[PDB]
Design a protein around this ligand. Structure first.
Ligand SMILES: O=P(O)(O)OC[C@H]1O[C@@H](O)[C@@H](O)[C@@H]1O
Ligand SMILES: O=P(O)(O)OC[C@H]1O[C@@H](O)[C@@H](O)[C@@H]1O
Lengths: 168, 212
């Protein structure tokens, strides 16, 4: 049973409509892309979804990130960080995200599969992704934050002009 | 009676605009009290549809939280409150209550004396979970030392399920709140520990005790 991602990049557990997870108690691997991945293997995900991906990744023993070279960064944050939020909490969460140093932007006209909204947070230079993940997860009204930092990639396969580079 | 202790604290909270209003049997008494102020307040922000309906019945205007960018006070009950003013809530609207409490400057906990505990955890801790994550989150709550029990036949206002976690002696509520909030699939945990109560009004046979 393999954990399978979403996006352009026995059976399986799948992260998008494009086994149900409750039917398994473990997954060997989860293979998925990312919007950004840093030198510490920490990622921003959710540009496309977010909650399903992070839950499946939490069950997999090994996260195998697959991406073209453009996704590699030194400091996470140029790509806006997605935060899924309970609708009634949108302005409250936005205020706290400003306090943490970001500029939250409501993703207009989009709802998640859970009926929530997304705030994409611009302008952060996320120097300590675990601390930032923890700070955003502390905010009442946050469902999921697209920082995969406490649980990042275990292996990354990067598509370069020269071939596939494997970073463990 | 226990209900008269609840009534004492609900009314004592009037001592403390747009008012943040909680939910449950103790909060219900505070709403009665607030009704006596129908012509004096601007209105309220409510943590549940039941509270909204009661407020409206007493002529109090109910604003959505998104209509304010700040709240002076939030008055609500709790299932447990410890000596550090940290609470377990959610036995009954957990997500809405925690979001409103995050906006309010002053959280006033109203409770009868039975809610005071030295160590949180005898009352099972509610955890609201995305349905597809139920089993995964339960495995992690076991690893953290709890016994998660699916609250059968209940769904939250957000369409999620609740795991009530039994058997924890929560010696460090902030650490535990942070550990549960870290779990993918957790929406909200009913530990109010990073943001606890600022004032507690405890109803006792000797009168209402105020703890700040
Ligand atoms: O590989 P792509 O098309 O760049 O898509 C990446 C996106 O698909 C998912 O993995 C997401 O988390 C993410 O945002
Ligand atoms: O005052 P009561 O009736 O004990 O009700 C307490 C409950 O109502 C709400 O505050 C909840 O968070 C909580 O579980």
């Amino acid at each position: 049973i393999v954990g399978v991602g979403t996006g352009s990049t026995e059976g399986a557990v799948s992260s998008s409509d494009a086994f149900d997870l409750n039917e398994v108690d473990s997954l060997g691997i989860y293979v998925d892309g990312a919007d950004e991945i840093n030198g510490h293997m920490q990622m921003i995900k959710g540009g496309g979804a977010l909650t399903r991906e992070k839950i499946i990744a939490s069950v997999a023993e090994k996260f195998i990130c697959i991406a073209d070279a453009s996704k590699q960064v030194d400091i996470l944050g140029k790509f806006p960080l997605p935060v899924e939020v309970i609708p009634m909490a949108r302005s409250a969460v936005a205020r706290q995200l400003v306090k943490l140093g970001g500029r939250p932007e409501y993703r207009q006209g989009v709802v998640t599969d859970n009926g929530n909204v997304i705030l994409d947070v611009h302008g952060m230079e996320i120097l300590d992704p675990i601390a930032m993940e923890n700070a955003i997860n502390a905010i009442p009204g946050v469902v999921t934050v697209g920082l995969f930092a406490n649980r990042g990639a275990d292996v990354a396969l990067i598509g370069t002009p020269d071939g596939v580079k494997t970073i463990v």
